[PDB]
Amino acid sequence: STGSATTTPIDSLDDAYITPVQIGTPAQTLNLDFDTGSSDLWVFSSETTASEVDGQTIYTPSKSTTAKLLSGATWSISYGDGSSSSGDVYTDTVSVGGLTVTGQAVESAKKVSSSFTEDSTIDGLLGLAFSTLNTVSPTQQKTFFDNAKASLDSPVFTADLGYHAPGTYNFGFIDTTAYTGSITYTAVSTKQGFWEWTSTGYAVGSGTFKSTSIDGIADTGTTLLYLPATVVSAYWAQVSGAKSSSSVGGYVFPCSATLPSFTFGVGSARIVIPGDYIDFGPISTGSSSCFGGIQSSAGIGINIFGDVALKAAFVVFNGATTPTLGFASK
C-alpha cells in the first residue's frame, strides 16, 4: 500500500504545516501537524476541556463506530517549545492520503496548553519519530508509520514541504518526479528516539564550505533551524544590523535586509536554503525588526533541522531495519 497527502502551511510564515487525517467511521477529518520529532498521535476531542478549545475541529469517539476506549491508558507529553497536552486513549481507524491503519492509538486530549488552544488551525499532532518516544502508559503505543510499515510497498515516508506553498507527505514510495538530481542517504541514530543524523558542514551565502560534523534531528514539527551558536553567529554576521536579542528571544535583523542563503551538508551533497526562507517577518506588527529563521540551539540540548531546512529538500525517512535519512534538492 501507499498514501499521499498534501500538507499546507498554517499561515503566511510557514510556522507549521497541517495535513488532513481521517479518523473513525464515518470519517472525521482533522488537520494534524505531522511531527517527525515526536511519537504521539493526539487530537482535540469531545473530551477536551471546553475553555481550552478555540476553533479547532474535534474528534468525537462516541460518533465513531470503530472507536474503542483503550482501557486504563493515559498520555501526557511536553514539547521542546514548552507546550503540552494530556488525556486518555482510543483505538480507531486512521487514514492518511488513502493509506489506512486499523487499531491506531488516537490519543484524546483532556487538557492542552495555551499555545495549542490559541492555534485554531492545528487539530492535533501526528508523530512520526520512533515509537520508543510514545508517551502512552502503561502500554506504549506505536506510531501511525510503525503500524502501517509492514503493509507499505517500501518502509519509508517522505516529507516535501513547500516554501509559502503546499507540499506533500508520501508513505510507502519515493516519488522520483519530486526532486532533482540524486537522493543522498545518511546514517541515522535512533538512540534518542529521533531521526538523528550528522550533517557534514555548512556554508553562508557564497562563502566557502566549512567541513564540520553537526549532529541534529530532522524535525518537521519544529519551525526553525537550530544550530550551534558558532554556526549561527557566522550566518548572522553576514547580515548588516543583525543581533541576538534576549528580549525578543533570538536573532533579529533589519527587515530591509537581503538575507544570504545557508547551505548544509549531507554527505558529499549540499542542500541550499534560500535567504528568503530564513525571513520570519516583523517581530511585532509594524516593526522594522524581523525575526530570523536560523537560531542558536544552545540551551535546547540538541540541534534541530526544522522546517526552514527541510523545506529546502525532498526528505526520505527510511524506516528499514537500519533506518536512514535521504536528502535531495528540488
Side-chain angles (χ1 to χ4, degrees), residues 1-62 64-67 69-109 112-141 143-148 150-190 192-242 244-330:
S1 64
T2 62
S4 182
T6 298
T7 193
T8 300
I10 66 167
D11 62 24
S12 64
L13 299 177
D14 298 346
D15 281 315
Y17 299 75
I18 48 172
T19 310
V21 177
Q22 282 72 47
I23 311 176
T25 309
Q28 302 180 39
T29 299
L30 272 69
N31 296 327
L32 305 189
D33 184 351
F34 284 23
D35 180 14
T36 62
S38 69
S39 306
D40 286 51
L41 192 175
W42 75 259
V43 296
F44 280 78
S45 72
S46 54
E47 301 179 329
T48 309
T49 300
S51 65
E52 295 179 352
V53 185
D54 190 1
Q56 294 81 9
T57 293
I58 62 166
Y59 171 59
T60 305
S62 71
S64 172
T65 59
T66 39
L69 178 74
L70 188 62
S71 177
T74 59
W75 63 280
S76 178
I77 192 161
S78 306
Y79 295 102
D81 64 357
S83 68
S84 64
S85 51
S86 63
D88 51 22
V89 187
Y90 293 80
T91 57
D92 211 339
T93 305
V94 172
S95 303
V96 176
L99 168 68
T100 299
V101 168
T102 57
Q104 175 65 46
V106 176
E107 301 173 34
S108 170
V112 301
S113 63
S114 64
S115 174
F116 286 115
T117 297
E118 295 165 357
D119 191 354
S120 64
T121 69
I122 292 176
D123 299 327
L125 265 67
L126 190 149
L128 293 167
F130 293 88
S131 291
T132 54
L133 295 179
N134 174 266
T135 75
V136 176
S137 178
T139 307
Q140 188 169 60
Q141 301 295 304
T143 68
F144 176 82
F145 177 53
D146 262 2
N147 282 324
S151 307
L152 296 178
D153 291 357
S154 181
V156 308
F157 68 90
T158 65
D160 180 11
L161 302 181
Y163 167 67
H164 291 355
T168 306
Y169 282 101
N170 290 329
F171 292 85
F173 73 105
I174 289 161
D175 180 356
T176 61
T177 74
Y179 58 86
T180 60
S182 51
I183 306 176
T184 297
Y185 290 86
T186 196
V188 163
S189 171
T190 62
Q192 290 189 86
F194 301 121
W195 291 92
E196 187 171 2
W197 64 290
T198 302
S199 173
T200 48
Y202 71 99
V204 179
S206 59
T208 61
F209 186 86
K210 174 72 168 184
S211 295
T212 185
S213 290
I214 304 170
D215 293 345
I217 66 169
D219 187 355
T220 56
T222 291
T223 314
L224 306 186
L225 172 53
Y226 295 89
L227 293 175
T230 49
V231 178
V232 177
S233 185
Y235 178 79
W236 288 110
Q238 297 305 309
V239 179
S240 180
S244 184
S245 169
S246 44
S247 62
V248 177
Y251 280 90
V252 297
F253 67 94
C255 293
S256 61
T258 301
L259 297 177
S261 63
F262 184 91
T263 303
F264 64 93
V266 182
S268 56
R270 307 289 180 254
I271 298 295
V272 179
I273 306 170
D276 290 343
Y277 290 26
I278 297 161
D279 179 14
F280 277 74
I283 60 170
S284 291
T285 305
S287 180
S288 68
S289 178
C290 274
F291 197 68
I294 294 174
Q295 297 292 346
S296 180
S297 66
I300 293 175
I302 195 154
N303 301 305
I304 306 177
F305 294 87
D307 299 333
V308 165
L310 301 182
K311 75 178 80 168
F314 176 89
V315 186
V316 180
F317 293 78
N318 172 25
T321 307
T322 297
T324 64
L325 275 170
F327 293 81
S329 297
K330 62 189 186 189

